[PDB]
Design the sequence.
C-alpha cells in the first residue's frame, strides 16, 4: 500500500518545504514588523509543543527500552554487541572529523573575505565565558555517568562552575559542583543497561519486571504514533519561525558560503557515501532503500535540531518499516543518541580548522590529530549537556590554544549546520543498528 | 449502622465549629499577644500537616486512577463521556459566572461605603505586579498541558516571567520561560488519560500494567482512609489558625458585607438550587441525599482552601458511600479538580463587577459577555498554578482595561470566599460524576 | 572458602591503610604544592564517584525494601517490632550520650592548653549563623516526615530559613519555608512503611506490587555487589584525598588530642563493650564474629562519612554473610540509618561538655539531663539534613545558652570523629537487626 505507507514522508517533506516558503514569504512581506513578538511566540509555539511532546517520552522510552533490550540477550553477547557498537561509533566519528579536515583544508573557507571581520560578531563578549577545562569536562562527563540521584538525573545534569575561593593570594579560579538543568540521559542509559543486565542475571524474579517495562515501552510507542502524526505541523511552524527569527535572503550565506557548503557536503558525503558504503560492505543490502525508510525522523531532526527529541520517532520507524530487530533497536539507538555525534565532530573540526585558517595558522600533522581525537571525545562530551550546541569548541581551542576571539561568528549560523548534524547523527545510529542486527543474525 | 456511618460527618462538622470557637476565643483573649509567632506556627502546624499528607497522594492517586479508569472503557465511549463532561463543566462555570453577574448587579455591593477607600489596602503596591498577558497565560496553559518532562511536572509548572531584553531602543518587556514550583496536575492528567487510552488499545501486554496501577491506587485509598480519620483535627486547627491570623470580630465583614454575602449566596444558590436541579432533571434522584453523602470532603474543602487537596477524600467518599461507579469516579473527578472551577469563575466575575461598580463603570452587554467568557476560561487558567488564588483577576482586567488600583482589597478577605469556592468546585465535580455515571448506565 | 570469603575484608582494610599511607606520603613529599587543585580534584574524584554510586541506589533500595519487608508480616507484629526497635535505638543513643558525659567529665579535655585559643578558628564568623530554633527544627522534622511531594522528597527536604518581615517595629526574624537540596529519606521511609502496611492490608491486589518491589530491590542488590567490588579503590583515594586536604602530621592532634581520644574511645566502648554485651545478654551469640561479618561496610562508613551511603553494602553484607532474616533486615536497617545515631549523640554531647569545660561551666545535673535528651532527639534531628554534620550542636547550645563563640574549632576536625560516628551508627543498626530477628524467631 504505497499511497498510505508513504503519506508521512510526503507530509513531512511538504511541511519542511511549506515551512521555508512560509517563513521566507513572511520575512519578505515584513516579517517581525508585521508580526510583533507576541505573534512570533504564537507562531513558533507549535514547534515548541512538538519538542515538549517529544522531550516528554524520551525518558520512559529510553529507560524501558534499554531495560527490555539489555535483558533480551545474555551478558556476553551484550558485551560483544556493545563493544562493536562503540567501536563503530568511534570509527564513524573519527572518519567524519577526518573528512571535515579534508574538505576544510581543500575548499579553503578561511580565505580573505567578508568573514575576516569579527568586531560585529564578537564585540568583546567572545572572550568572556566560563572557559571550562578539559579535565573538568571529562570529570563532569564521568559524574553524569553514575548519577548521584536517578530522579534528579531525569531532569538535571552535573555542571562544574568556577568560583574565586583563593583570596589568600594569587587569585585562581577553583571548581565547584552545582547541578543545573538538562536531563542526564547518559546516566539513565548506563543505569538502565546495568539494571537490565541485573534482571537477566536474575531469573523468574525479573520476568515480571521485564514484562512491566516492555508494556510501558509499547504504550510509549503508542504515544509516538500520534506525536508522529502531529509532527509535520510542528516542523513547518518551527522551520518557518526560525527563518523569520533572522533574515535569510542570503547575507549570512554570502558571508560564510564556503564554510556552510563544507559542513553540508561533509554531512552529505558522510551520510550518502561512507555509511552507505559500510552498510554495502558488511550486510550487502540497500542503504538508500533503508535511508528512504527513515526519512520522517531525519526531517524531524532537521526541524528540531535535537537528536534526543527525534529518537522516539526514529525507533518507531526503524522497528516498524525496516526489518530491524526489536531488541537490537532498543539497545543500540538510544546509545547512539548520546554517544554517536558524527556531524557534531565534523562541524566542530571544520569550525576549528576555519578559524585557524583565517589568521593563517599551520596545523601540520600533530594539531590535526589533536583536533581529531578531541573532536571524537567531544562527540560524547557535548552529549550530556543540551545547552552546549557549539559551546564545546571553546574548550578544544583552550586545549590547543587557538584564537577564540571570533567564536561568536558561528552563533549567528549555528542554527543551520546543527540541523544537518542531527540528521547525520540519527542516520549513523540507524545504520549501526542495521549493521549490528545483521551481525547478530549471522 | 447510622451511628458508625455518620461519625465522620459529626467529627468534621464539630471540628469546624470548634475551630471557629477556639480561634475566636483565642483572638478575644489576646490572640497573638498571648501566643507569639512560634506558638502560632505550632498552632497552625497540624493543618499544614494535613495539607502535606493530602498533597502527597494526589499525584499517585490522580495518575493511577486516570490510567485505570481511562482503560476501563473503549476510546469511543471515553471520548463521548469526556466531551459531555467538558460541556457540563463549561455550562456550569458559565452559569456560575452569569449568576454572579445577576447578584452583583442587583444587590449592589459597590455602593458608596467604607469600601470606597483603598489607600490602606493598596498603598501603591497594587499596580506593581508581573502583569501577565492573556496570550502568555494561554500559552503557559498549553505548555503545562503536554509537559516537557513528567518528573519535573510532578512538582513544577511552566510560568513565563518577563525580562527587559530590548535595550536597543523603546524598552519593552519580552517573555522568558522558567519552570517554577507547583505541580503540573493538568499535564499529568493529560498524560495519564493518553497513556490509559494507549493501554486499552494494547491488549494482553497492558493487563499487567493496568493491574499494577489499580493496585497502587487501591493502596493509596487505604492511605486516604487514615488521612480522613486524621482530617478533623487538622481542619479544627487550620480554621482556628487562620482566624487568629487576622481579627474577625466584624471589621472586614462590616467593610465588605454586601460583597461577601453575594459571593456566599452565589455559591449556595449554585450549590443548592442549580446543580441539584440539573441532577433532578437528568437522573431523577436525590441531590440533597447525595450532597449529605459527601459532607466530609466539602468541610475539608472549606478548611483547606485547595480543591486538589480534598480530592482523595472526595473520591473515597463518592466510591464508598454513594453508588457511583469506580471507573466513572476515577476518570471524572480528577478532571473536575483541574478544569471545573464554578466558584472561581463566580467570585472572579463578582470581583470584577464590584470593582467596576465602585467608580461607576457601565458594563452594559459586551463587557458582561467578555467577563463571562474570560472567567470561564480562567476557571482552568488558574488551575495550573496553585499560587494564583485570585491573581488571575488582574489579567482579566488587563484584557478589559478596568481599574486594578484596588485589587489588594480582596487579598485581606481572599481567605474566606475561596473556601466556599473550593466547596462548590468539588460539589460540581461530584454532581457531574453522578450524572455522567447514570448516562453511562442508561 | 576462607580465601575467597575474606578477600573483601582484606581489600578494604588494605585500601584504608594504603589510603593513609598514600596521603601522608603525598603531604610529606609536598602535597598540594606538587599536586595543584586540578590534580587534587582528580585525586579525590574516585571517592566522589563511589559516593555518587551509593547515593544513587539508596532511594530504590530503601523504598522497595521497606515496602517488601513491611508487607511480609502482619501490622500487629510490625508495630511491636517497630516499637521495640525504636526503644532499642533510643536506649542506645541515650546510653552513648551518657557515656560521652562520663568520659568527658573524667578525662577532662577542656583543661588549659593550646585549645584555649579560638581567635584563629572563629575570627568572628562563629556567631554569624542561621541560628535555627529548636521548635522550628522539630517542625521541619515533622514536615520532612509526611512530605508535601514524594518526587521532590526524593531529592529535597524542607528547611526553614528566616526573613526580616517585621519592618512595622521591633525587627524580629520570622520563619519562611523553602525546600532545599538533600533527600527526604525519613519521609520516604515513612511513606514506604505506610504503603507496605497498605499492601498487606490488601490481599490478592497487592501480591503483584510486592513482587514488583522485591524484584526491583533484588536488582538493586545486584548493583550493590559490583559497587562493593569497586568500593576499596574509592575508599583509598577518598581517605588519601581528605588527609592531603589538611596537613595531619599531628598539629591538630596535638591541639585536641584529649577530645579526639574521648570521642574515639567512646565510640569503641559503645561499639566493643555495650552493644556486644546487649547482644550477649539477649541472643546469647557471638557479637565479635557478627562484627567481623560486617567489616567492609564499617570501613566504608569510615571512608565515606555518610551512614546512608554505606547502607546498601551493609544490607547486602548482613543478609548474605550473617544469618539475618531478609524481611527483618529490610525493615530495620533503613530505619536505623535515619533515626539511630549513637555516635552522633555521643560526640555532640562530648562537644557540648568540652566547650562548657573550657571557661569552667558547672553542668551539675539538670544541664546534663538536658544535653542527654536534646542529643537523643538531635540524633534524628540531624538525620533529615545531610549538610548538618555538626551544625545541630549550635541549636542545642541556643537551647541551653552556652558559648557558641568557638564552635568553629571542631570544623577543622569534624572530618575525623564523624567517620567513627558513622561506623558506630551502622554498627548499632546491625546489632539491633540481629537482636530483633532473634526475638521474632523466639
Sequence:
Amino acid at each position: 500500500r504505497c499511497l498510505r505507507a508513504n503519506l508521512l514522508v510526503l507530509l513531512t517533506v511538504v511541511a519542511v518545504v511549506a515551512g521555508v516558503a512560509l517563513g521566507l514569504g513572511v520575512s519578505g512581506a515584513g516579517g517581525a514588523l508585521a508580526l510583533g513578538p507576541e505573534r512570533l511566540s504564537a507562531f513558533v509555539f507549535p514547534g515548541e509543543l512538538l519538542l515538549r511532546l517529544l522531550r516528554m517520552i524520551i525518558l520512559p522510552l529510553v529507560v524501558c527500552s534499554l531495560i527490555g533490550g539489555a535483558a533480551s540477550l545474555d551478558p556476553g553477547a551484550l558485551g560483544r554487541l556493545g563493544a562493536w557498537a562503540l567501536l563503530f561509533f568511534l570509527v564513524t566519528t573519527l572518519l567524519a572529523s577526518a573528512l571535515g579536515v579534508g574538505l576544510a583544508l581543500a575548499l579553503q573557507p578561511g580565505a580573505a573575505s567578508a568573514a575576516i571581520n569579527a568586531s560585529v560578531g564578537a564585540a568583546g563578549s567572545a572572550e568572556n565565558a566560563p572557559s571550562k577545562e578539559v579535565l573538568d569536562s571529562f570529570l563532569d562527563l564521568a559524574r553524569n555517568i553514575f548519577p548521584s540521584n536517578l530522579v534528579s538525573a531525569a531532569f538535571r545534569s552535573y555542571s562544574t562552575t568556577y568560583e574565586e575561593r583563593n583570596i589568600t593570594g594569587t587569585r585562581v579560579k577553583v571548581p565547584v559542583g552545582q547541578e543545573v538543568e538538562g536531563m542526564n540521559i547518559l546516566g539513565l542509559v548506563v543505569f538502565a543497561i546495568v539494571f537490565g543486565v541485573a534482571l537477566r542475571k536474575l531469573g523468574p524474579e525479573g520476568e515480571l519486571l521485564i514484562r512491566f517495562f516492555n508494556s510501558f515501552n509499547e504504550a510509549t510507542m503508542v504515544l509516538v504514533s500520534w506525536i508522529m502524526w502531529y509532527a509535520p505541523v510542528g516542523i513547518m511552524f518551527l522551520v518557518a519561525g526560525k527563518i523569520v527569527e533572522m533574515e535569510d535572503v542570503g547575507l549570512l550565506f554570502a558571508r560564510l558560503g564556503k564554510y556552510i557548503l563544507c559542513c553540508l557536503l561533509g554531512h552529505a558525503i558522510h551520510g550518502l557515501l561512507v555509511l552507505p558504503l559500510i552498510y554495502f560492505l558488511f550486510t550487502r543490502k540497500n542503504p538508500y532503500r533503508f535511508l528512504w525508510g527513515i526519512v520522517t525522523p531525519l526531517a524531524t531532526a532537521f526541524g528540531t535540531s535535537s537528536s534526543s527529541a527525534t529518537l522516539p520517532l526514529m525507533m518507531k520507524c526503524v522497528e516498524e518499516n525496516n526489518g530491524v530487530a526489536k531488541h537490537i533497536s532498543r539497545f543500540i539507538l538510544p546509545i547512539g543518541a548520546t554517544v554517536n555525534m558524527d556531524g557534531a565532530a565534523l562541524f566542530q573540526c571544520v569550525a576549528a580548522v576555519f578559524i585557524a585558517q583565517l589568521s593563517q595558522q599551520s596545523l601540520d600533522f600533530v594539531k590535526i590529530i589533536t583536533i581529531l581525537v578531541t573532536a571524537t571525545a567531544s562527540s560524547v562530551g557535548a552529549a550530556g549537556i543540551p545547552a552546549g550546541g557549539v559551546l564545546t569548541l571553546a574548550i578544544i581551542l583552550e586545549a590547543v590554544n587557538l584564537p577564540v576571539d571570533h567564536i561568536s561568528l558561528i552563533l549567528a549560523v549555528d542554527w543551520l549546520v546543527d540541523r544537518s548534524c542531527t540528521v547525520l547523527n540519527v542516520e549513523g545510529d540507524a545504520l549501526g543498528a542495521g549493521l549490528l542486527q545483521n551481525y547478530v543474525d549471522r
Observations:
- Residues 2-441 of chain B form a domain with the Proton glutamate symport protein fold (CATH 1.10.3860.10).
- Chain B has one domain: 2-441.
- DSSP finds 18 helices and two strands in chain B.
